[PDB]
Design an enzyme around this catalytic site. Structure first.
Site, mmCIF file in Angstrom:
data_model
loop_
_atom_site.group_PDB
_atom_site.id
_atom_site.type_symbol
_atom_site.label_atom_id
_atom_site.label_comp_id
_atom_site.label_asym_id
_atom_site.label_seq_id
_atom_site.Cartn_x
_atom_site.Cartn_y
_atom_site.Cartn_z
ATOM 1 N N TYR A 99 0.759 -1.239 0.000
ATOM 2 C CA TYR A 99 0.000 0.000 0.000
ATOM 3 C C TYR A 99 0.807 1.317 0.000
ATOM 4 C CZ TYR A 99 -4.141 -2.656 -0.082
ATOM 5 O OH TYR A 99 -5.166 -3.462 -0.504
ATOM 6 N N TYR A 109 0.467 21.991 2.350
ATOM 7 C CA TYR A 109 -0.017 22.496 3.625
ATOM 8 C C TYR A 109 1.200 22.954 4.455
ATOM 9 C CZ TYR A 109 1.223 17.638 4.677
ATOM 10 O OH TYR A 109 1.913 16.474 4.822
ATOM 11 N N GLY A 152 3.063 4.332 -1.054
ATOM 12 C CA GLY A 152 3.133 4.793 -2.446
ATOM 13 C C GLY A 152 1.900 4.520 -3.309
ATOM 14 N N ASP A 203 -2.121 12.815 6.438
ATOM 15 C CA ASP A 203 -0.676 12.550 6.494
ATOM 16 C C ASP A 203 -0.228 12.365 7.938
ATOM 17 O OD1 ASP A 203 -0.830 12.926 3.679
ATOM 18 O OD2 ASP A 203 0.608 14.553 3.700
ATOM 19 N N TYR A 212 -7.166 9.603 1.796
ATOM 20 C CA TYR A 212 -7.142 10.352 0.551
ATOM 21 C C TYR A 212 -8.391 10.162 -0.321
ATOM 22 C CZ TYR A 212 -2.356 12.369 0.794
ATOM 23 O OH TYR A 212 -1.246 13.114 1.104
ATOM 24 N N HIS A 242 -4.253 5.339 4.943
ATOM 25 C CA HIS A 242 -3.859 6.619 4.287
ATOM 26 C C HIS A 242 -4.474 6.739 2.904
ATOM 27 C CE1 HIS A 242 -0.985 9.587 2.407
ATOM 28 N NE2 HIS A 242 -1.276 10.196 3.538
ATOM 29 N N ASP A 243 -4.390 5.652 2.127
ATOM 30 C CA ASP A 243 -5.062 5.595 0.839
ATOM 31 C C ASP A 243 -6.574 5.829 1.000
ATOM 32 O OD1 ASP A 243 -2.570 4.953 -0.247
ATOM 33 O OD2 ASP A 243 -3.220 3.054 -1.145
ATOM 34 N N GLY A 282 -1.171 3.530 -5.545
ATOM 35 C CA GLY A 282 -1.990 2.339 -5.652
ATOM 36 C C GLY A 282 -1.932 1.507 -4.392
HETATM 37 CA CA CA Z 1 -0.979 3.578 -1.753
#
Ligand code: CA
Ligand code: CA
Ligand code: CL
Ligand code: CL
Ligand code: CL
Ligand code: CL
Ligand code: CL
Ligand code: CL
Ligand code: CL
Ligand code: CL
Length: 121
Positions: free
Chosen positions: A24, A63, A26, A88, A48, A44-45, A28
């Site tokens: 996961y 930010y 980076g 983040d 987003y 995190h994905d 995709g």
């Molecule tokens: Ca990812």
């Protein structure tokens, strides 16, 4: 750059040690996360994804933040920038929290080794 700076401040590692970790971390992400650090990246994905559905462009937003003894303080002119910072922050805190099981063998993990189902957000 910014997420990368946050990662370095919180983990003691270079940003490059997280950027292609597991399935996961980076761009995709599919199949089952390899470990707790990789679950940070799965969350995190997902974070987003929620921001994109709100009208934000979290992969592009810039930010402001500081790291003190009190933690990470997020800021920005727009709510979308502050939201990106918050996603983040959660991930950088989660990396820190899982430093104990971080495994160098999963850095630059070839996504061809990723197997199993994709957990839902
Ligand atoms: Ca990812
Ligand atoms: Ca990988
Ligand atoms: Cl939330
Ligand atoms: Cl985006
Ligand atoms: Cl914090
Ligand atoms: Cl904050
Ligand atoms: Cl701005
Ligand atoms: Cl906004
Ligand atoms: Cl290691
Ligand atoms: Cl290391």
């Amino acid at each position: 750059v910014q997420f990368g700076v946050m990662i370095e401040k919180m983990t003691g590692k270079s940003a490059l040690q997280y950027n292609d970790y597991g399935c996961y971390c980076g761009i995709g992400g599919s199949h089952w996360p390899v470990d707790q650090t990789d679950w940070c990246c799965h969350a995190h994905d997902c974070c987003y994804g929620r921001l994109e559905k709100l009208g934000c462009e979290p992969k592009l937003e810039k930010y402001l933040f500081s790291v003190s003894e009190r933690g990470i303080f997020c800021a920005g002119r727009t709510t979308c920038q502050r939201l990106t910072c918050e996603c983040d922050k959660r991930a950088a805190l989660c990396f820190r929290r899982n430093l104990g099981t971080y495994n160098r063998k999963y850095a630059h993990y070839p996504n061809k080794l990723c197997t199993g189902p994709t957990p839902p957000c």
